[PDB]
Each structure stands twice: as structure tokens, then as C-alpha cells.
Design a protein around this ligand. Structure first.
Ligand SMILES: c1ncc2c(n1)C[C@@H]1CC[C@H]2N1
Ligand SMILES: [Zn+2]
Ligand SMILES: [Zn+2]
Length: 582
């Protein structure tokens, strides 16, 4: 309690000495509350005019148009302590999992140099405004690094002064760039050195890319066993227990010297004890604390979610296979059985899973897994939209399994070769491409963001008639040499000025380990579409009068956008499609 968080609390007390008051009408039940102080401030979604002018039929589709318009009483809930048997299962599994992940890796600190480079090419590290304008400026000023230095030496002393969260089924905890640096220095290696790659972790998909995920699910489907299970957790980040945070901290057992000490401080002082500031309209700032739940940087959150999800799913697999009988208590001989299972078949059981943070697909040895719920429920990983003790429903076909907001189609090229392609409802794709975030977008910057969406569609969603046509239209409407951009940056092969046919050949043929025949594709007409009925099932407007008029008159839409942008060098990509090729 207050000995680890007090210093942080004390410091804030003073910067607002004119405003401090222990409010008696505070709305917190599960968060420990400390005090309040005076503020008065808040980021709505803006429309991308380039993409909207080239997607006119979707102007009358509410599922698209409603996306651009516009629970914190789930952050304020509590998880129960798991039973002794559960805690033992988790500790044995976590110990074994860090050793496996460590066999072909070496923990190490990330550098000021590495951090500086990340900030100087716009990765969302969730920082705040103050003393310097942007992150770009703070990193070049040596005063910052003295602030970082002061904190760094405070952490080696086992104490914290400035590592405080700012709150804003989503909840994002921004920190000041300094606290973010120290998190990255100690734990950045998990992402920077690919601990959750499929090669390293067997269950993981870190860095794999949307073009690989379907091939990975088809490889899991080839294993002998039961249905494919894809159970979503209800508010995963809020169900992370203090026992979870303690098993995650065991990565420090593989560290040495300074690194070990810096990493122990991040886990102890910032993850297993937290200090947060929250906007309350009644407008004040509330200084609240709690020991459990996930509140880390988004990138460390991804890696530790993947770890604890891999652990939870191996234990659910152990329950289905009868490795242990009850979660109340692991006997002496059950412990040795669990250890022996892990050593004997643990790596095989990891390969039966695809795990992306809180998102999983599991192909267990058989369907006993469906009704193996005691460990999963007692660890607090309660399933979404199903009653606590109702057996999971599994999927019989890998092409129907949801994963990372997609499903996957098997698509045969006219030349016999097999593509496994990513897909989702087309209203979701079009609605997202019509949205920008933040202020001060020039017309050129708005055009370059539209071009980023268009090139992603050409590479990932070429098989959707409407998206291949709209992607060609946007790329024809934006000057040929203008560089695609984003403001928060899977593997993004579409972020390039290289010709998209050359990039398609590299991704889907040359570098595709599931494609034996490396014969290059010479034109977009060799690249197939879904069946027309399947395209309609997944949200295509093919067949509607609105869509026919849009396609027939597309040059008029392209020319409207070219007229707004002005007298620039453009390329016509529409003749890459059979119907515009005369
Ligand atoms: C153990 N620890 C770290 C690494 C390896 N093995 C293999 C390759 C070369 C360096 C890095 N990746
Ligand atoms: Zn600190
Ligand atoms: Zn589909």
C-alpha cells in the first residue's frame, strides 16, 4: 500500500496545493481513492473526404455511415483470488513457459538510441503533452534524459516518483514519455526480439501478418483432434489477477545485473502497484490506485496478454485431458503429472493454438475441452456471451473460425495454385477507411491516408470485387508519387511507393512458404476473386443498381477528386481490370 505509491501521491498533492480535497461523493468502489484537484478539458472521429467521394454507394448504408458518428463500470469491478490448486497450476505452467520462450532468445535492455529512433518514425507509445510540445522534441533535449536519469536511479533504489497512469470495452492508460522509456528499456526486448513469433513461442503470431494468419489456422486444422475453439474473454485486461502479474514477473528470473533490477522495479512499482488520474465531469481529476488488472504500454500489454493467454489455454487443455481432477488442491503426484505433461507434450499442445494477446484459437486433442471450465473460470478468464457453465461451441471448419477480427477463405487461382486470404464484413472495411483521427490534416495528408487504405485493400482484400475497384479508383485519384501515411503504425507491406503488383508477387508468391511454385503473376487479371455469391455473403454490393452506376461512371468520381487536389501527375489504374481494359 501507501509506502510504494505515497511518493507519487505526495508529489501530485503539491502541484495542485490550491485544489486538494478528499471528496466524500467519490464514485469508486474497487479502486482505492486518495484525493481530487481542478482541471477543464476532454477527440472525435473525422471523415476522410478522398475515400468517401470514391465510395458513394456506401453514403446510404447505415452500417458504414454510423461508424463515423460520436464500459468504465467494468474497470470498477473486482476478481476473486483463485484456489490453491489453480495458483499451483499457473506457477508451474508459467515457470515452464518462460524457459521454453528463453531457449533460443537472450533478455537484454532496449536503448535510448532504439527509443529515439522509434519516436522519430511515429509508433504510438501512448505518451502525453507539460514542458516539451511533442515526443520528437523531448528526446533531443538532454534535460528530459536527466529527468529519466533521476527516475532510473529512484527505481534501482526500489522507489518511484513520476510513473503515474492517465485514463481515457476500451480503456487506454497514457504515461509521460519518461515512464514509457523506462518500461521500454526493461521489457521492450519481448517485442523488439520477437519472443512471441510463431517460430519462438509455437502458439504466437507476433509479426506474422494478415496474409499468414489464414495459412496458420489451416495448419492447426491439419492436426488430429476435436473442434476449433475460439472463445472470447469478457474484458480480458480487467480479469488480470495479481497472481497473473506475479507469474509474468518471473521473466526477471532469466535476467541479470542492472537489467534484472530495472525490470523488477517496472513489475513491482508500476504493474503490481498503480497510480492513475481520471477525468470526472462532476470537471476534477481523481487520483486512484489498485494492485491488479492490466495497465502497461500497449506493446508490453500485447506480449504479456499473449503469455498469460498461452498459459490459461494450456491449463484448459490439461483439464480436458484429465491431467488434474480438481482446482481446490493439486496433490504431490498431480504436480509431477502436470510437470511431466509439459515436458512430454507441452510444445505439441502449444502448436495446436494461435494466440494474439487476448484472442485465441485452440484445436485440442478432443472435445472434452468444450466442458473443461473450472480452471478457466477460477483464473477469472470468464467467456463472453455464454453462461458460466455452458459448454463451448466449437467450429468444424477452419474457414468459419473468427481470429483477429477476420475469417479466412481458400481461393484457387485459374492456374491451380492455392491462396488463403483474410476477409471481414465489407461494411467494416469501408467504414474504417472513411475515418481519420486528429486535427490539422492537409488535403495532401488526407489523400496519402486514403492511398494507405487503398494499397492495404489491393494486397489483403484484392478478392473483394468492390474493394479492388475502389482501391484502383483511389490510387488513380491520388498523385502517383505521393507516399502513403498513417499516424499510428501485423506487417504493413502496403506502406510503400513500389508498384502494388510487384508487392503482391513478393508477399503471395515469392516469400509465401505455403506456395511451392514461384512462377510470378504478370497482371492483376490472373489474381482471382471470391465466388460472386460468397462476395455478396461477406457484404459486396455487386448486383445493386447503386453499385453498377458507381462502377460504370468511376472515371467521373476519379476526375472529381483530381480536380480538388489540382494539376499533379496521376496514373490511370482502372485498365488493370478486364471491364475497363476497353
Ligand atoms: C539466442 N539468443 C539470442 C539469439 C539467438 N539465440 C539466435 C539469433 C541470434 C541472436 C538472437 N537471435
Ligand atoms: Zn517510476
Ligand atoms: Zn469473407
Amino acid at each position: 500500500n501507501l509506502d510504494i505509491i505515497g511518493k507519487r501521491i505526495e508529489k501530485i498533492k503539491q502541484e495542485h496545493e490550491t485544489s486538494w480535497h478528499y471528496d466524500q461523493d467519490h464514485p469508486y468502489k474497487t479502486w482505492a481513492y486518495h484525493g481530487s484537484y481542478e482541471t477543464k478539458q476532454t477527440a472525435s472521429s473525422m471523415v476522410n473526404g478522398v475515400v468517401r467521394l470514391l465510395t458513394k454507394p456506401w453514403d446510404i448504408i447505415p452500417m458504414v455511415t454510423q461508424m463515423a458518428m460520436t464500459f468504465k463500470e467494468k474497470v470498477d469491478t473486482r476478481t476473486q483470488e483463485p484456489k490453491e490448486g489453480t495458483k499451483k497450476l499457473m506457477k508451474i505452467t508459467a515457470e515452464w513457459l518462460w524457459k521454453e520462450l528463453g531457449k533460443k532468445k537472450t533478455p537484454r535492455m532496449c536503448t535510448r538510441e532504439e527509443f529515439t529512433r522509434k519516436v522519430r518514425s511515429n509508433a504510438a507509445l501512448g505518451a502525453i503533452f507539460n514542458k516539451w510540445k511533442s515526443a520528437r522534441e523531448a528526446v533531443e533535449d538532454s534535460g528530459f534524459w536527466e529527468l529519466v536519469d533521476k527516475e532510473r536511479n529512484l527505481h534501482l533504489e526500489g522507489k518511484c516518483e513520476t510513473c503515474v497512469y492517465n485514463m481515457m470495452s476500451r480503456a487506454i492508460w497514457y504515461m509521460w514519455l519518461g515512464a514509457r522509456f523506462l518500461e521500454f528499456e526493461a521489457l521492450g526486448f519481448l517485442n523488439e526480439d520477437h519472443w512471441f513469433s510463431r517460430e519462438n513461442s509455437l502458439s504466437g503470431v507476433e509479426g506474422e501478418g494478415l496474409h499468414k494468419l489464414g495459412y496458420i489456422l489451416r495448419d492447426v486444422s491439419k492436426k488430429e483432434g476435436g473442434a476449433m475453439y475460439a472463445d472470447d474473454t469478457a474484458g480480458w485486461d480487467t480479469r488480470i489477477t495479481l497472481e497473473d502479474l506475479k507469474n509474468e514477473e518471473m521473466v526477471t528470473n532469466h535476467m541479470e545485473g542492472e537489467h534484472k533490477k530495472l525490470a523488477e522495479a517496472i513489475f513491482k512499482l508500476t504493474y503490481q502497484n498503480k497510480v492513475v488520474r481520471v477525468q470526472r465531469p462532476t470537471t476534477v481529476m481523481d487520483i486512484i490506485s489498485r494492485r491488479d488488472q492490466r495497465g502497461s504500454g500497449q506493446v508490453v500489454t500485447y506480449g504479456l496478454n499473449t503469455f498469460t493467454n498461452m498459459e490459461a489455454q494450456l491449463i484448459r487443455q490439461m483439464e480436458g485431458e484429465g491431467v488434474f481432477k480438481s482446482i481446490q488442491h493439486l496433490t504431490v503426484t498431480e504436480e509431477i503429472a502436470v510437470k511431466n505433461w509439459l515436458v512430454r507434450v507441452g510444445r505439441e499442445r502449444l502448436s495446436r493454438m494461435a494466440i494474439s494477446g487476448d484472442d485465441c484459437v485452440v484445436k485440442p486433442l478432443d472435445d472434452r475441452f468444450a466442458s473443461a471450465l473450472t480452471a478457466l473460470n477460477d483464473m477469472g478468464k470468464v467467456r463472453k456471451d455464454i453462461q458460466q457453465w455452458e459448454p463451448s461451441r466449437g467450429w468444424n471448419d477452419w474457414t468459419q473460425v473468427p481470429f483477429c477480427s477476420h475469417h479466412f477463405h481458400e481461393l484457387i487461382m485459374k492456374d491451380g495454385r492455392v491462396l488463403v486470404v483474410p476477409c471481414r464484413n465489407q461494411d467494416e472495411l469501408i467504414g474504417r477507411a472513411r475515418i481519420s483521427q486528429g486535427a490539422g490534416w492537409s488535403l495532401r495528408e488526407t489523400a496519402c491516408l486514403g492511398k494507405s487504405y487503398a494499397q492495404m485493400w489491393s494486397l489483403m482484400y484484392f478478392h473483394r470485387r468492390d474493394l479492388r475497384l475502389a482501391a484502383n479508383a483511389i490510387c488513380s485519384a491520388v498523385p502517383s508519387h505521393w507516399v502513403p501515411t498513417s499516424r499510428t503504425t501485423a506487417t504493413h507491406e502496403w506502406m510503400t511507393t513500389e508498384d502494388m503488383l510487384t508487392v503482391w508477387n513478393r508477399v503471395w508468391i515469392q516469400e509465401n512458404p505455403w506456395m511451392e511454385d514461384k512462377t510470378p503473376v504478370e497482371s492483376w487479371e490472373e489474381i482471382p476473386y471470391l465466388g460472386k455469391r460468397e462476395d455478396q455473403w461477406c457484404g459486396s454490393l455487386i448486383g445493386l443498381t447503386s453499385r453498377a452506376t458507381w462502377a460504370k461512371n468511376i472515371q467521373t468520381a476519379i476526375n472529381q477528386v483530381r480536380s480538388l487536389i489540382g494539376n499533379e501527375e496521376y496514373t490511370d489504374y482502372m485498365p488493370s481490370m478486364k471491364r475497363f481494359r476497353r
